[PDB]
Amino acid sequence: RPTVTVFGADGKPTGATEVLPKVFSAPIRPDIVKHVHTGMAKNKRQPYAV
Amino acid sequence: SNVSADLIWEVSRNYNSFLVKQRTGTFSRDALNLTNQHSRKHAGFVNDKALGIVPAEKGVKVIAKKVKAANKPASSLYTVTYKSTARKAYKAIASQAAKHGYRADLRQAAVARASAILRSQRPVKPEPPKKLRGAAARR
Amino acid sequence: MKVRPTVSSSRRKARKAHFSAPSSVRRVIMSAPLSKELREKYNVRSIPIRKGDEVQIVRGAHKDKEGKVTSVYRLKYVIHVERVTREKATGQTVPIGIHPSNVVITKLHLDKDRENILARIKAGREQVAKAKGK
Amino acid sequence: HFRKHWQRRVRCHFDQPGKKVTRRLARRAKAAALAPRPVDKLRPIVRCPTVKYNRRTRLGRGFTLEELKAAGIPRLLAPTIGIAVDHRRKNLSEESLAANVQRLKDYKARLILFPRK
Amino acid sequence: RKAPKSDNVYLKLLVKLYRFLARRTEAPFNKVVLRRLFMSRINRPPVSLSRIARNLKNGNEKKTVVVVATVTDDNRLLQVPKMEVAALRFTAKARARIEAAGGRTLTLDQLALEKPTGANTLLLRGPKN
Amino acid sequence: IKQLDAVYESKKGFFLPANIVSQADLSRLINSTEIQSVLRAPKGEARTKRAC
RNA sequence: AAACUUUCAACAACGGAUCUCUUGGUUCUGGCAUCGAUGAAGAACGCAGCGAAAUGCGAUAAGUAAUGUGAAUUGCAGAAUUCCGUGAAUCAUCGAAUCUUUGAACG
RNA sequence: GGGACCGAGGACCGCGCUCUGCAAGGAUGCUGGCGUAAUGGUCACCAGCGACCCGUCUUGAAACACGGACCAAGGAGUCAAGGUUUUGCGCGAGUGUUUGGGUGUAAAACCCGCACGCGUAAGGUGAGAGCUUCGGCGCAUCAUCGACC
RNA sequence: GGGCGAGGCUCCUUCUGAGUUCCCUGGAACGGGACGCCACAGAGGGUGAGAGCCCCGUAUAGUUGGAAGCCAAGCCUGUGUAAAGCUCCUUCGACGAGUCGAGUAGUUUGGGAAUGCUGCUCAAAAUGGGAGGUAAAUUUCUUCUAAAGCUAAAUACCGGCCAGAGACCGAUAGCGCACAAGUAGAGUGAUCGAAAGAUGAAAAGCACUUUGAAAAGAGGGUUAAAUAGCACGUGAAAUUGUUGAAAGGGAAGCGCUUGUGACCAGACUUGCGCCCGGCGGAUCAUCCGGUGUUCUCACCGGUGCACUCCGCCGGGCUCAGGCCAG
């Protein structure tokens, strides 16, 4: 499993090392994102009517 | 894996933050783009191996991707500044692009980009005075 | 960012309240900053303008003109500094409306009420300065 | 199926999240008044009537007087210590009596009862 | 069809891979797989574990099972034999049941690497009706 | 980062999706020894000389 | 050739489109429960130094008392405020008053 | 032998011939004037030839009939519910969080305990895509003989 | 069991961060550049043009005074053979009438076992009455108690007192009404019912002179602007005046192609490369060390102090260069 380095408050590596949490290997599907994002952005709207 | 140059092109072919679209053609503002044209050949950020040339104070500044540091942006660019003669800059850039199998297709494009930057750094000739014609000349 | 539900971010309501404010509210809106010497003397940043004060204009066509306040015209959100005037066609001089935000108070008209005003602002400023300090 | 004047009787639930916040605040108000007490009342376990649902149990309205006496809880004190009482329900079987008596003894084990004054 | 109706990026890569294979090989296997990647979902019915188990009963064992569809699970099958199945998609239960038996699950791009010409392959389709 | 494994292990009725392709690098697949050994000889070039 | 008719251009007219703006509308959500014989809602007439309307008030009449703030109002004219003060203000708040003719309207 | 119109392509590759080469898979070579309104373009006009006023409606078709003084702005297949077909997406013998409850940076986003809606609880022969160790194996589907309820 | 009750919660109310630092344009910086600061506050608004730090406010914790409700640590007391919960039993145990119900008429419901209601005729019962289950052998069994009454909460809300918002409309739109709009006005009356926003940052709303009876005009002036003068931001078209050009023997307008006249956009101005000469400068080749990488390619520093390398200038030559042609 790949790993990722941890950085401190000064920007230098601290020697700590963590494992990539398995969600960054998920398929990248922009078509799913567009479909899901389109609906989720509509869920904030307020009604308008004459 | 799930991520490759082919995938990034598919995700980013139709829209990018670097994309400039007009009626006469499509350009790209990518710093690792030698011809500033939108294509898989020339999309530097898409490709694992790519080149880019930017002007310096005198000469050219060539940046190449490091394949073993794709996930470390601060240490992902191999940067060389060429401030010697133009011919020596062309020799290094072309060898940088073709002598080891690092984008030999970009050899001609890279040398041309270096030439344009060096030409653009040359002093500018003063333009000739404008000449009026016909009705404008008679008034 | 606004948090309290009683606060409103509406442009329509803010402009309505500002232009329809009563005289007492307009006095607060017509405040002016205090000079640097007065800041280190009273530990006070700003104070509502009034008639007796002496101000120095720091914004507008009147670059660095000094004078005493003559009128606080709260109906149009302007003050009248002395000798800051323009002549009409007839040659009669009329005052030029200067906004309090464009001036700085150099000398302060002092009375028991305004010493109370300055003391209350100082009390809050020193309270949080020590609260933040320790 | 719009043969009547449906347009004048159409209810839109645009206050669904607003009413939820109102309901959550009302529950918080009860906890504010009854600070250590729970905001609900203990309710018995009952069996659904129909043969379709008789294999499943749920919560009833209140405890029967017989099963309240078997637990050892007086009638007049039960509504006062947070127990619902139903004078209409009958036991009719030892199974319902035992289940709710055991429920009451479990409630008594977890109870903290303060002195009156 | 020239461009698939789907917006899946990975499906486009599969089409591009098999378009190259169909042009540069004489295997009719690659042309069938390419043409099935183009068609719609209703034209790609699911293939169940029961149906694939039937079709390798006689002598088609130790072969590669290829369906351009989704592979589903069937509760009627009690025992699942070891098999080599390559498909567009697998369900969570069907994939687990195949792996529990001892078989292996492949994608269509892995099939291209292992069997670029469809050698020793059993190609099936789901019930249209 | 540590919690990111736990949050996706707790979503009910959801597992991390399985992609329809295993390798996304087309250049590696096409230019592999397995594919190239079984290909036919090329039938032409990118640009063809026009005869007449 | 001019005049007249027509076309275009510049300038100028007629008219108020376009752009820009908005103390307005419209829709949704939240907290709360408060008209009247102790005379309501509505109608009328009066009241300002200079006011027709709108607005405010009722012969104490563009208002009185009390509380707070703290130096105005302003279109003009006239008074202020001593500012080291029960105190300006077409100020805000508001628990006390005045409150013409009618109107459920009641000699 | 005398005219006219045209010069598409852009390293090589070919067919060939009369081979130090060529008229053979598409124009080169030499020269002159000018280098600016000169070519070219836009307007207005004259000239030669050409050319019914739009729309609607009726009809096989015309014709009649109706609308048209001019300009600016506005101006007409939308929303909701219920069915249904096709495309994309998710999960798939299951699927649907959003009545409701729990968090929240508060009408968003995140999470889900119990019900509930819709659906679900094995042959012979001939063709036949595709594999083949060349002996054969045979998807889907159709035809026929079946088997079961 | 009664009476005080510190104090507390809710709501109003006082106060609480940081640039008006330098330069440029500008009538005016709130714009551009530079150098800073605050931030539990970079929501919003104003200030002469896009302001976190000029001003009001904004955020969090406090802090000043007040209002009315409710809670409440504690402190005084209590009282009368006073009230209350249960347990047991050789004693008792009252439960709603012109109301159910039957008949009939109208109406109503998905509901003639009348689904409910109402009117009329008759008019009850007490191991009673109502409803339901059931072929199960008789109408067994189940479940309630009508004709008296009270009660918060979850639910509705185009109205009342406010408050917060919007992928809404932007003055023929949005409510009829952004304005002294249910107004002006019409009708005997019930009722009907409009049009109508914008000078400028600031009136600084043109002193004064002159012509005119005056309305106004012209100078002069304010302003960044009067190409902003209250017939006031910007100011299209229809329609009209003047000036400039042109055409016109009973229509004009439209298509193709020249010509005339007026008016114009391009293109070009030279680049490249060789051979000499005058230079001005050491990023010439090589080698050494360090570093970076694509592990063999580079870059820095040194050596290389001149038939090598880089830029300029003065000549010669080649090639490529615009338009129309032979």
List its salient traits.
part of a larger assembly; 6 chains; A: 50 residues; alpha+beta; 2 strands; 24% strand; elongated; B: alpha+beta; 5 strands; RNA-binding
Measured between the Cα atoms of the first and last residue of chain E, the distance is 24 Å
- How far do the termini of chain D sit from each other? 64 Å
Form type of chain E: globular
**Count the strands of chain E?**
5
Order of helices and strands of chain E: HHEHEEHEHE
Number of helices of chain D: 3
Structural class by sheet pairing and helices of chain D: mainly alpha
How would you characterize the largest beta sheet of chain D?
2 strands, antiparallel
**Widest sheet of chain D: strand order?**
1-2
Shape of chain D: flat
Largest sheet of chain E: 5 strands, parallel
**What percent of residues of chain E are in strands?**
15-25%
Largest interface: E-F, 27 and 17 residues
Assembly context of the chains:
part of a larger assembly
Rg over C-alpha atoms of chain D, rounded to the nearest angstrom: 20 Å
| SSE order of chain D | HEEHH
Q: By helix and strand content of chain E, what is the structural category?
A: alpha/beta
Q: How many strand units of chain D?
A: 2
Family (chain A): Belongs to the universal ribosomal protein uL4 family.
Protein name (chain A): 60S ribosomal protein L4-like protein
Organism (chain C): Chaetomium thermophilum (strain DSM 1495 / CBS 144.50 / IMI 039719) (Thermochaetoides thermophila)
Pfam families (chain C): KOW (PF00467), Ribosomal_L26 (PF16906)
What's this entry about, in short?
The structure is cut from a larger assembly and holds 2 copies of chain A, 1 copy of chain B (139 residues), 1 copy of chain C (134 residues), 1 copy of chain D (117 residues) and 1 copy of chain E (129 residues). Chain C has 134 residues and is an alpha+beta fold.
Description:
- This is part of a larger assembly, with two copies of chain A, one copy of chain B (139 residues), one copy of chain C (134 residues), one copy of chain D (117 residues) and one copy of chain E (129 residues).
- By secondary structure, chain A is an alpha+beta fold.
- Chain A has one helix and two strands; from the N terminus they run ββα.
- In chain A, strands 1-2 form a two-stranded antiparallel ribbon.
- With 117 residues, chain D is mainly α.
- In chain D, 35% of the residues lie in helices and 5% in strands.
- Chain D has three helices and two strands; from the N terminus they run αββαα.
- With 129 residues, chain E is α/β, with parallel strands linked by helices.
- Chain E is 40% helix and 19% strand.
- In chain E, strands 1, 2, 3, 4 and 5 form a five-stranded parallel sheet that branches.
- Classes of the chains: A alpha+beta (50), B alpha+beta (139), C alpha+beta (134), D mainly alpha (117), E alpha/beta (129).
- Chain C binds three RNA strands through helix 1, helix 2, strand 1, strand 4 and helix 4.
Task: Describe how the helices and strands are arranged.
This is part of a larger assembly, with 2 copies of chain A, 1 copy of chain B (139 residues), 1 copy of chain C (134 residues), 1 copy of chain D (117 residues) and 1 copy of chain E (129 residues).
Chain A: E1 3-7, E2 13-19, H1 30-41
Antiparallel strand pairs in A: 1-2
Chain C: H1 11-19, H2 23-29, E1 31-33, H3 36-42, E2 46-48, E3 54-57, E4 66-73, E5 78-81, E6 85-87, E7 93-95, E8 103-107, H4 112-133
Chain D: H1 16-33, E1 45-47, E2 57-59, H2 65-71, H3 94-109
Antiparallel strand pairs in D: 1-2
Chain C binds 3 RNA strands through α1, α2, β1, β4 and α4.
Protein name (chain F): 60S ribosomal protein L4-like protein
Family (chain F): Belongs to the universal ribosomal protein uL4 family.
Organism (chain F): Chaetomium thermophilum (strain DSM 1495 / CBS 144.50 / IMI 039719)
